[PDB]
């Protein structure tokens, strides 16, 4: 009960879902400042179903884990993630997050994917905004199911069945 | 005519209301309903006696409102230093 299981429905609904992406950014790093950049002022995101750019999971289901983080943030983020609605996607934005760039330390959390499952990595710290665009284009066609892995291997149209959803 | 019977019932019900209500605020609510019961009656009779019962009504309303406001004001002033929640939780005047 989510818009699937007839030819029609699944493409329909999936187009709906795919094109309405509402980003909730989880700044805690330099990413954010590039993210405000990423919003406006050169390029738009409103043409990708985004007026949502702001802090409520009550407004979004696209999780952008944006920035290098610490131990103290893991349960927090976890919980924030939990307080989203049922279908939800996890972007792991940038190197700082994705595998912990140039820090090997107790303080930090390396490999953000630990805390929550991921579907999209987008390396580079900083990356270019545009890379993120490319990434969400990916994520678009990914949730559309018109994607694979680099071994031709298919995957679910959500991030949210890799570990438990709620 | 029916309505005017109804009006008396609505008053009666209201009395039962007032008497049941353990918390005060809800008492006060019950009363308000009674006040309108009257006014309904009044409206029927206005059709009879020519709409002076309209003007009446208007006045009634205003007074009622007035009497509400101030009473609630009082309720406030009572429980802005209290956690009690019904009238007979204050009792020392009884003898």
């Amino acid at each position: 009960r989510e818009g699937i299981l007839f030819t029609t429905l699944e493409k329909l609904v999936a187009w709906g879902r795919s094109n309405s992406l509402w980003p909730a950014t989880f700044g805690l790093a330099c990413c954010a400042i590039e993210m405000m950049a990423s919003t406006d002022a050169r390029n738009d995101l409103a043409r990708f179903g985004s007026e949502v750019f702001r802090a409520s999971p009550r407004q979004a289901d696209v999780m952008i884990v944006a920035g290098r983080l610490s131990k103290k943030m893991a349960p927090v983020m976890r919980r924030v993630w939990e307080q989203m609605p049922d279908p939800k996607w996890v972007i792991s934005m940038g190197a700082c997050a994705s595998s912990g760039g140039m820090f090997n330390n107790y303080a930090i959390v390396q490999n953000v994917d630990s805390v929550v499952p991921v579907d999209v990595y987008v390396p580079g710290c900083p990356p270019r905004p545009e890379a993120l665009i490319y990434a969400v284009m990916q994520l678009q066609k990914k949730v559309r199911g018109q994607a694979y892995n680099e071994r031709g291997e298919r995957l679910p149209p959500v991030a949210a069945w890799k570990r438990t959803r709620g | 005519m029916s309505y005017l019977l109804t009006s008396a019932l609505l008053f009666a019900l209201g009395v039962y209301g007032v008497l049941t209500r353990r918390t005060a605020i809800l008492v006060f609510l019950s009363i308000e309903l009674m006040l309108n019961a009257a006014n309904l009656s009044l409206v029927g009779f206005a059709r009879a006696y020519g709409l002076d019962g309209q003007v009446a009504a208007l006045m009634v309303i205003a007074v009622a409102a007035a009497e509400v406001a101030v009473g609630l004001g009082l309720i406030v002033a009572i429980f802005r230093h209290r956690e009690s929640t019904a009238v007979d939780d204050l009792s020392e005047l009884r003898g």
Binding site: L28, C30, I33, A41, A55, V76, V80, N105 | -
Partner: protein, 268 residues
């Protein structure tokens, strides 16, 4: 009540957990609770080389990156007594001041965003892009830089750097004004800012505030004047100052700084 304003909210994006002891309509005191991020750079860098440490320096200042970098650079340079070419030093100030402008752009950008009218941010950002484009040119990096190198920067300027640099200095004065234009009038601006941000100069030092807070309370305290370091000795420019600790004052200071910075560019 003690209200708990948690991290990442709303778009203020300090890790901020804040225990606001309220009167239920006022703030009494805030016990700020922080430290929910941390790395321990200071530790890590003893486990990397000096060269390597230059990686770390802009990685703790989203704003003026190059300043951290410079400050660290200087320290090293002093230590082994190394000198820097004059041209190098020229470049270094240029980047620095360019980075200051950047910082200010972001400061006011966020200021608007944080609260008050949202929009002008985007214009300030347009300019920021211009700045970024300048950085992109010379360092191949949007921000974070390593162009500065020990003994001076590591390679020559682009020629392309000269046109564009002039260009943006042309546009900016006017632009700056127009941002300023939003603030000083708007009597609502007044009614949101003037009264608040209070703190005596005396207490600013006791609790430790630094320029553009201290100088936001108009107390002259440019470390570039007081402990004048390279080139700035021989550059004219003045101190921009407020005269009281409030938001209101801060905001205007910054605008003036930018103009000073621009003259320094011009000088450079």
């Amino acid at each position: 009540m003690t209200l708990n304003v948690g991290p990442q909210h709303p778009s203020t994006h300090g890790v901020l957990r804040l225990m606001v002891t309220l009167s239920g309509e006022e703030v009494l005191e805030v016990v700020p609770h922080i430290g929910y991020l941390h790395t321990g750079f200071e530790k890590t860098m003893e486990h990397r080389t000096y060269l390597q440490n230059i990686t770390y320096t802009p990685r703790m200042d989203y704003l003026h990156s190059f300043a951290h970098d410079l400050a660290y650079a200087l320290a090293v340079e002093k230590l082994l007594g190394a000198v820097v070419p004059p041209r190098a030093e020229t470049i270094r100030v240029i980047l620095n001041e360019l980075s200051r402008l950047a910082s200010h752009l972001v400061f006011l950008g966020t200021g608007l965003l944080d609260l008050g009218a949202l929009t002008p941010f985007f214009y300030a950002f347009r300019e920021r892009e211009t700045i970024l484009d300048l950085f992109e040119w010379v360092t191949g990096q949007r921000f974070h830089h390593n162009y500065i190198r020990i003994g001076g920067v590591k390679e020559d300027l682009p020629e392309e750097f000269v046109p564009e640099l002039k260009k943006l200095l042309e546009v900016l004065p006017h632009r700056i004004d127009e941002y300023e234009a939003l603030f000083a009038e708007s009597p609502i601006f007044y009614e949101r800012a003037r009264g608040v941000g209070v703190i005596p100069p005396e207490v600013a030092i006791d609790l430790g505030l630094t320029g553009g807070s201290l100088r936001a309370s108009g107390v002259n305290y440019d470390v570039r004047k007081a402990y004048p370091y390279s080139g700035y000795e021989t550059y004219t420019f003045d101190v921009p100052l407020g005269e009281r600790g409030d938001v209101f004052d801060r905001m205007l200071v910054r605008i003036r700084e930018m103009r000073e910075s621009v003259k320094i560019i011009k000088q450079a």
